[PDB]
Recover the amino acids of this structure.
């Protein structure tokens, strides 16, 4: 799970 | 909805979304070794990336795309966006690069890192171009939004994807409309509008070049164990490998 | 100067007349299609095209008015971008394929024969699809190629003397004239003002992608050189070396 | 002056 993908959610 | 905004609304939205200007971690009790300078620049990029994601979510229409398209566009554009912001911040400081307010560097300081002075020289030349053109903040924010939407847009066959791609192209056209409107409001003649539109968009060829050279350099630094990189930067860099 | 006084029609006509020939590759179906064989075909073709590119550049309005050092600088910056935009143009009529030459039409599965090449193929193919989407016209293509030649190296172009400053300003004036020519062509074709400005931007954004693919191709070519995958001509080695 | 490209641009 990419950090960037995570940050685009919150 | 995003595609129904007027030119004034688009520029206003982009101006309001501008990210904060962060400080580097620079401790002036320590000298600028290659490793320390690389650590300062990459740590700054890491912290700026969080704010870049907030900014991207405020670019009209961006959050209407799938998360895969948002990831891909940011993976393609991130260093271009950092670098165009750097050049903008440096306009008022001929001969220097304002990485942060506490990290204003000249080309000789760039020699602290092998291969970096060549990149500094290109960024400094681009800052001179911004000054020559009297680049305005309204034009700068349009260019940054264009980079975000354009840099990754050709490497995009389902229906949903074609839909997302069409949305991006329609928004790129709306930003063109906004740039022309700003130039017309500012008093430029019709010929001056198309000539300046082209001058501005050609900036993006040079920004792309500098991002590619910076990405190659960052990979080289990583491959030589010069600097540890965050998981985010490792993944951002791996998107280009 | 005479070149800086040309009309839009004169600029477009001059660029159409300067178009280089389309050369053939050495492709032989009987040869094992190894990484080394494919890369030999591509580098051999690029070498032969470079000679014709020099003749073409000398016909771009104003180019021969610059110093020899200026001309070398601009070609060293732009050469692979110019080859690649020509490749994309030739490939427009062939969805899913890259027309390196009339006898060398390669798909992405053939590109997989070379390490690191399919990624480059995918970018070039996507750019060809964009050309198709836009219905790019030959008059627009030739203006873009001239813009690459004059723009790619112009930020690093030295202006440390009055004469070199003058030449740098001449390049920027000619870039403006080529923009004028593109707009004139699109107006004559019936586009509204809004459509003209939108299309000008769409066309110039292509050049960001061309730059990207050139940089990726140059890194790949350097890797091939370092790994001794294929022999490169003296000219290619010198052009490659001008990119560090 | 000894670059191949320099020679081709003259010839
Ligand atoms: O320019 C940068 C930056 C950078 C940092 C902050 C900015 O706002 C802009 C660029 C970061 O890491 C690098 C790392 C490199 O190896 C080379 C570079 O040129 C850079
Ligand atoms: O694309 C090319 C071409 C090429 C050849 C002819 C053209 O008209 C365009 C590109 C040449 O050598 C390469 C060599 C490489 O290592 C990678 C490449 O992508 C290329
Ligand atoms: Cl912070
Ligand atoms: Cl003359
Ligand atoms: Cl695949
Ligand atoms: Na922060
Ligand atoms: Na116009
Ligand atoms: Na055979």
């Amino acid at each position: 799970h990419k950090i960037l993908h995570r940050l685009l959610q919150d | 909805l995003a595609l129904s905004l007027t030119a004034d609304q688009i520029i206003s939205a982009l101006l309001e979304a501008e990210p904060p200007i962060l400080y580097s971690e620079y401790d002036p009790s320590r000298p600028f070794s290659e490793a320390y300078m690389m650590g300062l620049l990459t740590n700054l990029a890491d912290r700026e990336l969080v704010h870049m994601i907030n900014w991207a979510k405020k670019v009209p229409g961006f959050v209407d795309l799938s998360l895969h398209d948002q990831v891909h566009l940011l993976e393609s554009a991130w260093l271009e966006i950092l670098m165009i912001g750097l050049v903008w911040r440096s306009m008022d400081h001929p001969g220097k690069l304002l990485f942060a307010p506490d990290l204003l560097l000249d080309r000789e300081q760039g020699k602290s890192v092998e291969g970096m002075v060549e990149i500094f020289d290109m960024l400094l030349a681009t800052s001179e171009r911004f000054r020559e053109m009297k680049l305005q903040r309204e034009e700068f924010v349009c260019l940054k939004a264009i980079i975000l939407l354009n840099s990754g847009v050709y490497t995009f066959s389902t229906l949903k994807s074609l839909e997302n791609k069409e949305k991006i192209h329609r928004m790129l056209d709306k930003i063109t409309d906004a740039l022309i409107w700003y130039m017309a409001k500012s008093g430029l003649s019709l010929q001056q509008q198309h000539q300046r539109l082209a001058q501005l968009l050609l900036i993006l060829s040079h920004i792309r070049h500098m991002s590619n050279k910076g990405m190659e350099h960052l990979y080289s630094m990583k491959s030589k164990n010069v600097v540890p990189l965050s998981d985010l930067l490792l993944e951002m860099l791996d998107a280009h490998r």
